[PDB]
Amino acid sequence: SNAKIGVLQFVSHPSLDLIYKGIQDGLAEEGYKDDQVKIDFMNSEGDQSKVATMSKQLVANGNDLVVGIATPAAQGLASATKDLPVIMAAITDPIGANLVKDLKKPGGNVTGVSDHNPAQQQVELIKALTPNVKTIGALYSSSEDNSKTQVEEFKAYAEKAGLTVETFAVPSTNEIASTVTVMTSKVDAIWVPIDNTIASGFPTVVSSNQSSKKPIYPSATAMVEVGGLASVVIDQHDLGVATGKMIVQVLKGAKPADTPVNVFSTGKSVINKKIAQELGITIPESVLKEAGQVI
Numbered sequence: 001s002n003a004k005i006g007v008l009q010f011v012s013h014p015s016l017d018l019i020y021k022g023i024q025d026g027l028a029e030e031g032y033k034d035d036q037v038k039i040d041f042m043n044s045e046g047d048q049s050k051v052a053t054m055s056k057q058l059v060a061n062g063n064d065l066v067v068g069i070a071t072p073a074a075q076g077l078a079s080a081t082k083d084l085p086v087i088m089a090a091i092t093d094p095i096g097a098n099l100v101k102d103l104k105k106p107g108g109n110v111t112g113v114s115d116h117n118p119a120q121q122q123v124e125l126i127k128a129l130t131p132n133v134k135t136i137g138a139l140y141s142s143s144e145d146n147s148k149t150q151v152e153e154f155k156a157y158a159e160k161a162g163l164t165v166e167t168f169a170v171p172s173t174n175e176i177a178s179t180v181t182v183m184t185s186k187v188d189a190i191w192v193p194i195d196n197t198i199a200s201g202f203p204t205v206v207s208s209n210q211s212s213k214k215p216i217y218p219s220a221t222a223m224v225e226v227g228g229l230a231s232v233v234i235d236q237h238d239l240g241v242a243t244g245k246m247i248v249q250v251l252k253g254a255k256p257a258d259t260p261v262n263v264f265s266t267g268k269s270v271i272n273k274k275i276a277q278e279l280g281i282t283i284p285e286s287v288l289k290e291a292g293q294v295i
């Protein structure tokens, strides 16, 4: 009765907006819509100062639980409260983010949905689609715990497949353009993990790379659709619906400490056909046939 939730979205990028749409759809499917739920929505605009101030407000405002969309938002909320339920919406590495003890028994007030990056499949796609690529530049933020883990895992798989990965971390969106310029003289392809900083500034990557014409393998449909070549990605709307359903489970009494994390890990490829063709890339018949989405 009297359901009230607070939602902190870390920043505006299209993937997070679609996750939030999914949250609303999942709530509505369970009857939590219109007069049956009050949602207090806030967006920290990628600003850690806003994360702190907004988290403090959301956990002290009579909400039954709070929801953090993306790792920095969930971390802000989990720091601000140890007793109010905190639901993760698409946190790539909950253990490495210090949000849960393990996936089975989170052990505190935090549970939710995790989008694991399919690094092995991305490496396989790079090898199949651009067999001339030898060195990959990993562009990501040093501010994001999610990306630290993904870069480690990707590098391990890439090395096994005979590729080299050089890292180009940025502390913020401000350093993207200049970093792209530097890295594109050093690497054959740009890879971007599930990274909120780069996702929020992705058109800057595309515009900065117009002169270099290196393929970009960025870990979101929303990035591939505005100039990336291809990736292997998890369905964002599915992440949001699953988060909505876990919010309802917790409203109905589930204890976060004993509620397993819902991990998505396999995804499907997404291929930007015109970007490939413009780069003079052949899309192998099998690659095109197995594609989850063709743009």
Ligand SMILES: N[C@@H](Cc1c[nH]c2ccccc12)C(=O)O
Pocket (backbone or CB within 6 Å): 015, 016, 069, 070, 071, 072, 090, 091, 092, 093, 115, 146, 193, 194, 195, 196, 199, 219, 220, 236
């Ligand atoms: N999983 C990311 C958030 C996220 C979800 N979908 C994305 C797409 C692009 C970049 C980031 C994201 C995190 O842990 O914070």
